[PDB]
Amino acid sequence: YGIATPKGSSLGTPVNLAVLKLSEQGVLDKLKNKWWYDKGECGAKDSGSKEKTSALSLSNVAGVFYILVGGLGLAMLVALIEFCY
Amino acid sequence: GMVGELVYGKADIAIAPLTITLVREEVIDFSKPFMSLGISIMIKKPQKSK
Amino acid sequence: HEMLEGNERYEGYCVDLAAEIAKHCGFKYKLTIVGDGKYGARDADTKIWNGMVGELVYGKADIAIAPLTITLVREEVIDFSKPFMSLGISIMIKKPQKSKPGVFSFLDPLAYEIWMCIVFAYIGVSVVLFLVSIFNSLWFSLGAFMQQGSPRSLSGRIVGGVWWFFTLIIISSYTANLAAFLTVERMVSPIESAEDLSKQTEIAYGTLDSGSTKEFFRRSKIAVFDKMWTYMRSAEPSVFVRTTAEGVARVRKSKGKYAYLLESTMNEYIEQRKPCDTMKVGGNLDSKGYGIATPKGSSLGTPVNLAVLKLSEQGVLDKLKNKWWYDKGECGAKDSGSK
Amino acid sequence: GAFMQQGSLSGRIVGGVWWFFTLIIISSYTANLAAFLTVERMVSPIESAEDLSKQTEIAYGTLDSGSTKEFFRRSKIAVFDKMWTYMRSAEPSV
Amino acid sequence: GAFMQQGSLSGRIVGGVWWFFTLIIISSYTANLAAFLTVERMVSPIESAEDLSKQTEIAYGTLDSGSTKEFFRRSKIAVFDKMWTYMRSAEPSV
Numbered sequence A: 001y002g003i004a005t006p007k008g009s010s011l012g013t014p015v016n017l018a019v020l021k022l023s024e025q026g027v028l029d030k031l032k033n034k035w036w037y038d039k040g041e042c043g044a045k046d047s048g049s050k051e052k053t054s055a056l057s058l059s060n061v062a063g064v065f066y067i068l069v070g071g072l073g074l075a076m077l078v079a080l081i082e083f084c085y
Numbered sequence B: 001g002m003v004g005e006l007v008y009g010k011a012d013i014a015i016a017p018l019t020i021t022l023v024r025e026e027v028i029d030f031s032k033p034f035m036s037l038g039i040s041i042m043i044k045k046p047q048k049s050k
Numbered sequence C: 001h002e003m004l005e006g007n008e009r010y011e012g013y014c015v016d017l018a019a020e021i022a023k024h025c026g027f028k029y030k031l032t033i034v035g036d037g038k039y040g041a042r043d044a045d046t047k048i049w050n051g052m053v054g055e056l057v058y059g060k061a062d063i064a065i066a067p068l069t070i071t072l073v074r075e076e077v078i079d080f081s082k083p084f085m086s087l088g089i090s091i092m093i094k095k096p097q098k099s100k101p102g103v104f105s106f107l108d109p110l111a112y113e114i115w116m117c118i119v120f121a122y123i124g125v126s127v128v129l130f131l132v133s134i135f136n137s138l139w140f141s142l143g144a145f146m147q148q149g150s151p152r153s154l155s156g157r158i159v160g161g162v163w164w165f166f167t168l169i170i171i172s173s174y175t176a177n178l179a180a181f182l183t184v185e186r187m188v189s190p191i192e193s194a195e196d197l198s199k200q201t202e203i204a205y206g207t208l209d210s211g212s213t214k215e216f217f218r219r220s221k222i223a224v225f226d227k228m229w230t231y232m233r234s235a236e237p238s239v240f241v242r243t244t245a246e247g248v249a250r251v252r253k254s255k256g257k258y259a260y261l262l263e264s265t266m267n268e269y270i271e272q273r274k275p276c277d278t279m280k281v282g283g284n285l286d287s288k289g290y291g292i293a294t295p296k297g298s299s300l301g302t303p304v305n306l307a308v309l310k311l312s313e314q315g316v317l318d319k320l321k322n323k324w325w326y327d328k329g330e331c332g333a334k335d336s337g338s339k
Numbered sequence D, E: 001g002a003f004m005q006q007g008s009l010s011g012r013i014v015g016g017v018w019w020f021f022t023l024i025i026i027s028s029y030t031a032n033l034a035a036f037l038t039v040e041r042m043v044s045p046i047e048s049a050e051d052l053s054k055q056t057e058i059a060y061g062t063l064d065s066g067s068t069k070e071f072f073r074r075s076k077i078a079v080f081d082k083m084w085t086y087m088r089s090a091e092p093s094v
């Protein structure tokens, strides 16, 4: 993008030079960070990185641990009726 | 357009996201690019893990 | 080159660019070399321009076509054209194949959380065999833990059965995922962004000792970049290199423990050259571009400016960028990473 | 207590054939599970212009009238012209 | 007879530890062996004329002068143009 001035306009070159001054001083990138990231509604959705995990998930293995302790508890329930009979 | 209101005198300067094209460079004076950009890809990032 | 002469002695991106500019303008040209070799510098005491910028102001040249950075101090003496190639401060790191043997990669199939959770089921089932039937009961439960899971009571029968189905899914899952990384290796770091490169001190990073890259972080008022400057200012040993050839040579001999920040044009060019190890990661940090320079009030200023915009619209510039970077590139990593 | 450990005279072929049955099931469970982990290990789709043009499941389009569409039209690059010829003839309208 | 069936308190922990070692090897045998059968599965074998140009392990070229070489030169097709750009600068001379 750019700023436009009429051909042969007085303020043509002064504005052109004034844009290079704002860029090197970092005023343009600072203003870009203002209305985009700072005042943005998803400032948190720009820091978390999603990468390819190497290891195997713990959630799928949880389904096996919840069916094991579910058997250990059911086992101790049958241990008491066999001790009385 | 905004380029029209510069060649026809209804305004003195146009400050906006104005794409620097050749057909516009022949009629008005463009400054240096104050913001670089290009055509990109927008995809809805999954949101797939279940 | 010794067997050639004229303009056919040289070749490159700007060599083809000069022929296209002259074709739409209709003049003959000659390719000359700058004397001192270092362009775009104005002494603080004498105020005498040198390089290719001084040859235009002093009349020793008519036009200049080369990767010349567009700055404000150069605009007050000569005329700059619109940018023909955008770039910015990027990150260059060696491609980690990994190619990562070790003991931390052995317990990789199962996760760090499953290796430490299976033991909670081990000692949890060996302690039930105490209850369904101490120095000989743990001696027995471990002898009853090895052989799957004297248990005449029905309480102890289903403990060895569920434990059998429980260890079945774990050993099936261990084999399944252990085959998933001898088939495809990503693998897969390291983070491409620049803000992640600053939050750690394991892998060093630096820029050129003198140039536009170091001054960008010095006066930057952005939070992310200021922490990058306070690091390199107090980072020992010297994280700055003398020339650009020393910075690229320092990332190659650092075992992936040193990064170098430079322009994306040079970074993308090194990635496509031997030994094919550097890879540009993440987006650039700032917005800058090259351009063509003409003297103020010259008869070729506006006519050449209108020609570059015609080149970019017809897809000519990107076709030239894809020519001397990726087509004629010696990239052997695109053939070594898929074999 | 005979199921947790695999499976005389007559009871030999009972536990003999039962073991071979539960052999294939625990073999099929391990073989099938390995395939779905290798598929997601492949993905992707990777951030690039060609990976967007190499597949056609996740379709892609631009604006109907604008500088974006005119880019692919007169583009003389191999990767982009392939994207143009795709969207130019893609149905329904992308 | 105690080594086939997996693996005193001293010998009981010999039985528990010998299993977790042989359990990983048989899995490291099973998992790695699946990697070499999936490998082949990705043969070509035996591919199309287009995919011959997508890889550089197997080199390809034509005669130094004839109707065949000129075809790839002026072929505006993207596939044959990619083939021509390779053979034109491939070193050594193909």
Ligand SMILES: CNC(=O)N1N=C(c2ccc(N)cc2)c2cc3c(cc2C[C@H]1C)OCO3
Pocket (backbone or CB within 6 Å): A054, A055, A056, C098, C099, C100, C101, C105, C106, C107, C108, C109, C110, C177, C178, C181, C182, E024, E027, E028, E031
């Ligand atoms: C030379 N070896 C090697 O480079 N690796 N080790 C294999 C590996 C193969 C078999 C066994 N038993 C253990 C590791 C591996 C296992 C994984 C994994 C990634 C790998 C690849 C690397 C770390 O991600 C998850 O699991």
